Ligand binder design. Structure first.
Ligand SMILES: [Cl-]
Ligand SMILES: [Cl-]
Ligand SMILES: [Cl-]
Lengths: 162, 162
């Protein structure tokens, strides 16, 4: 198990533009094309992202390439952030994937707002962090995913993703 | 009227820590301290932000200084974003405040997701941008503020804030 297999479980793989649970145009493995209620905007952003005329359809390799780019952007989002970086640095390999997962989902600034839970993680207070993250709107918006991520923070294992 | 007075109206001015409409600890002029449900964490972040032991209370000059920082951070976020910069550059002085207002509220990445409305704004298609922005979650969560900002995009005047 790894960050790539982890996010594939959470995001799923689809080679055609589709609307996620929130009604946002998405493709590949959790790649948000646009928040705009516009298929043209979705397709437009897709063509730029892939570098060809896709017509809302990409290949497996293209999806995996774009996925690798999004993961890199998530890690860079963590490492450029004063609040997320020291936490990340202190975390083990498994727990780092959980943090990366969060930033992949809601972006740098979103996760950085959980200041208290971030302190707890850095101080290796896993259960406290788990309890506090469960109070968030993030948990409320995507509870199934949050449970898997939070469990990963708590156990430091891949039990939630088998 | 200006960006400072504009946000003073939308965010309000408070010299003591308080929960915003979403329950998040805030102070000054819309300055988010933390998303954590912990007053101590909020006070801790505040002391860091000001550089003294505030016990959840700041001065007006401190709020203004902090507010000016937040506005600068919002403008920097715009100018360092490939989707926001060209739009911002093309806009008049008033509609620029509307864009800054949005970024000030939901951050750079959040506003950058409105790819279609951003294209319409750059093409001066104000009505079309208003229609698409009116369909956003942002409009559903904070309708009064959003309605003012949208109206400001449609007219390019301050009449919605008088
Ligand atoms: Cl939009
Ligand atoms: Cl938290
Ligand atoms: Cl939104």
């Amino acid at each position: 198990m790894n960050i790539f297999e982890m996010l594939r479980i959470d995001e799923g793989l689809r080679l055609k533009i589709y609307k996620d649970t929130e009604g946002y145009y998405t493709i590949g493995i959790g790649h948000l094309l646009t928040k705009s209620p516009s298929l043209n905007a979705a397709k437009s952003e897709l063509d730029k992202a892939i570098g060809r005329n896709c017509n809302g359809v990409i290949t497996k390799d293209e999806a995996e390439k774009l996925f690798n780019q999004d993961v890199d952007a998530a890690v860079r989002g963590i490492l450029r952030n004063a609040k997320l970086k020291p936490v990340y640095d202190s975390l083990d390999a498994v727990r780092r994937c959980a943090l990366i997962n969060m930033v992949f989902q809601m972006g740098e600034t979103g996760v950085a707002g959980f200041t208290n839970s971030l302190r707890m993680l850095q101080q290796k207070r896993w259960d406290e962090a788990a309890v506090n993250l469960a109070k968030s709107r993030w948990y409320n918006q995507t509870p199934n995913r949050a449970k898997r991520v939070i469990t990963t923070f708590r156990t430091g294992t891949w039990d939630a993703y088998k």
